[PDB]
Amino acid sequence: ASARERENLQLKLEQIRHSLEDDLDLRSDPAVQAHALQDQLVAHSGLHLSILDSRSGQPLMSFGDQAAASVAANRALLARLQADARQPVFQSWSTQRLLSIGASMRMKNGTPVQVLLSSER
Amino acid sequence: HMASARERENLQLKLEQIRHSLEDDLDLRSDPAVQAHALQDQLVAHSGLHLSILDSRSGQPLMSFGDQAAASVAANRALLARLQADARQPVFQSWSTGQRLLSIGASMRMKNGTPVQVLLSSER
Ligand SMILES: [Zn+2]
Ligand SMILES: [Zn+2]
């Protein structure tokens, strides 16, 4: 493994260490503590997920790496989705190089949502 | 400046995994908070990263989650053995079996006092 790959995994381990040793909530039970560690692993995974309400376009849920998030990219991708573009819709976004993919999904209760998944390239 | 066919295919696979978690989970309840939790768990499951945290005193897993494509039973066993033989930390491990993995391991002490061994693995 290369010098930069090793450097990057060491920086990720340091994020895990900070979560375990400094931020750990002593009041939480182990399953909550485990999910909080999960949150920190996904927070620097290069992946971001936005769930929008199909009716209003308003954000319902947002998870993952802020580094893979962009308000402008997500607005543009939602516009293509609402403009009947063939799904799933792809979008390359460079200002930072993101690849994103969007599609409508239907929750179990029928609630239509727009699902926008972004990735750092 | 545009994403390749392989980049597109890989991201489409992840989106379809997310769709499986929303539309094909027979036991997922309708409660909107419960839906957020399922999606967040599934995002980690294909993040290309896997994290194993073991109690140093017993060897028993305390936490395990992430992507199984990033995990190797054999590699983790070899890395854990290097940690327990007081190799210099953090310990790096490359591993191949078709796929090529990069893992890093270190001993830590959780805030509540538990001594743990941390095995972080990544798809190269
Ligand atoms: Zn912190
Ligand atoms: Zn969960």
Numbering used by the authors:
A (entry chain A): 38 to 132, 136 to 161
B (entry chain B): 36 to 133, 136 to 161
Question: Paper's wording?
Answer:
In the CzcR-CzcS TCS, the HK CzcS is predicted to be the transmembrane sensor-transmitter, and it contains three functional domains.
The structure belongs to the C2 space group and it contains two molecules (CzcS SD, amino acids 40–166 in the CzcS protein) per asymmetric unit. The structure of CzcS SD is a mixed α/β-fold in nature, which can be divided into two domains. The N-terminal helix-loop-helix domain is composed of the H1 α-helix (residues 40–60), the connecting loop (residues 61–66), and the H2 α-helix (residues 67–81). The C-terminal domain contains five β-strands (S1-S5) and one 03B1-helix (H3). In the symmetry operation, this CzcS molecule can form a homodimer, and the Zn(II) is exclusively buried between the central parallel H1 and H1’ α-helices which constitute the dimer interface. A distorted tetrahedral geometry is adopted by Zn(II) to coordinate with the symmetric ligands (His55/Asp60 and His55’/Asp60) from the H1 and H1’ α-helices, respectively.
